[PDB]
Symmetry: C3
Subunit: 152 residues, 3 copies
Amino acid sequence: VASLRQQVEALQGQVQHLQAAFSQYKKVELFPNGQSVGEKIFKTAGFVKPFTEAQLLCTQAGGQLASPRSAAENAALQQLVVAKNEAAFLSMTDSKTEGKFTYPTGESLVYSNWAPGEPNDDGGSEDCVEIFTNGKWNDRACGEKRLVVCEF
Amino acid sequence: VASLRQQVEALQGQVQHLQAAFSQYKKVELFPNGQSVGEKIFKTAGFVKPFTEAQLLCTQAGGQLASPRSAAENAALQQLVVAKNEAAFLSMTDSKTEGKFTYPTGESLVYSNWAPGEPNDDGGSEDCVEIFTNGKWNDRACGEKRLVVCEF
Amino acid sequence: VASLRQQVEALQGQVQHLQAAFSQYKKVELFPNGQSVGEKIFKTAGFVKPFTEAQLLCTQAGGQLASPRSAAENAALQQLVVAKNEAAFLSMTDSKTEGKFTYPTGESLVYSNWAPGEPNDDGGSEDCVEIFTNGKWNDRACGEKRLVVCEF
Ligand SMILES: OC[C@H]1O[C@@H](O)[C@H](O)[C@@H](O)[C@H]1O
Ligand SMILES: OC[C@H]1O[C@@H](O)[C@H](O)[C@@H](O)[C@H]1O
Ligand SMILES: OC[C@H]1O[C@@H](O)[C@H](O)[C@@H](O)[C@H]1O
Ligand SMILES: [Ca+2]
Ligand SMILES: [Ca+2]
Ligand SMILES: [Ca+2]
Ligand SMILES: [Ca+2]
Ligand SMILES: [Ca+2]
Ligand SMILES: [Ca+2]
Ligand SMILES: [Ca+2]
Ligand SMILES: [Ca+2]
Ligand SMILES: [Ca+2]
Ligand SMILES: [Ca+2]
């Protein structure tokens, strides 16, 4: 009765403390390699790797390569690319069917931000996608090394 | 009443497990680029930038440049400077009124740890402040590049 | 009473939110320098240091040097070492009594994964332990520099 009321106030204090502490912790974690947008979080590893290796790193970490699905997400991702001044790989490829880019699941793109003239499968060997510091996309050979950015 | 008790008992167990997990992840987070002191957390980006750019990075991240307000805070900040072996910028400047250093809010300093002979406005143009590996402060030209350390 | 009911229900909602948000941040934190195994978390500083320096870094951060106590923990640590491609120091040494490796607490090893013929106290001066990218252990001079990996 009167006891439960006291225990509740104690619990209330514990939760409010956690909310304040967690909020501060989130800001700390995201500085300087992460960006939060909606319920998605982009985070860069800070180094470059070929597509296959970059892809494995994200999947093993429980996430996947950056997959911007809107202008808002693309802008958030662009911030990390600008901050590191290094173009990054996206998760999408047209390795299965040339000319048709898809997400790792197989789904067709729901949003794109291709630079003028892209994708152009230059040299007949560009199945991966990179995002420039200006936010635009370009298909690029998967063997090339680009900034690793995963989404969680 | 009775059901409410077990409900409170259960929820608190969950909150305390969350507290324990959060405490562990906070220690992990701070290693090796952060330092906690009181309710404040200092975290370095690991690279150098001129004052204006450094200031923007911290503000955009939801914090501000390191602003040690006591010997204890200065000591905590010093650890990061020593770890990176790179002097860092503080948030304070005397741009508005020469010789009068203030925090971003305009408030006058409540603590200082100037090195002997400082501040001296060398060349007649040193309005920013840097902290050395020995913990002492020195006014420095804002255009120079120093370690970026923010506080949250 | 009905008020306490509402309060308890309110807390349940706040806790569910924290649980979900924290779960996401745990994954974010561990990328790309951490590894979780059981209730233990290994995290690398990303650089090399001699044993004494490495040990101090971990202890001051509230943890200790990597101390795999099972094949499962050793495999998890190995994943991290492979990712960084740099042999790392473990916490154990036989500095007190030659030939008898112990944890920082003085307790004898409960698990080991020595490479064939090791430990061999090569040159009569190897009291520290390093873990290779293949997961095997080798006693090594404490003065040498190895990847710093702490456990929390
Ligand atoms: O390697 C340079 C080339 O890379 C291609 O991906 C691009 O479509 C070309 O316009 C050119 O920039
Ligand atoms: O650039 C070197 C100079 O930097 C000034 O900030 C300092 O006051 C001088 O004593 C000298 O060290
Ligand atoms: O420094 C090279 C040597 O290092 C020792 O620790 C090892 O036992 C030897 O087999 C040899 O590899
Ligand atoms: Ca193709
Ligand atoms: Ca193609
Ligand atoms: Ca192209
Ligand atoms: Ca972190
Ligand atoms: Ca001035
Ligand atoms: Ca001045
Ligand atoms: Ca000066
Ligand atoms: Ca010995
Ligand atoms: Ca020995
Ligand atoms: Ca040996």
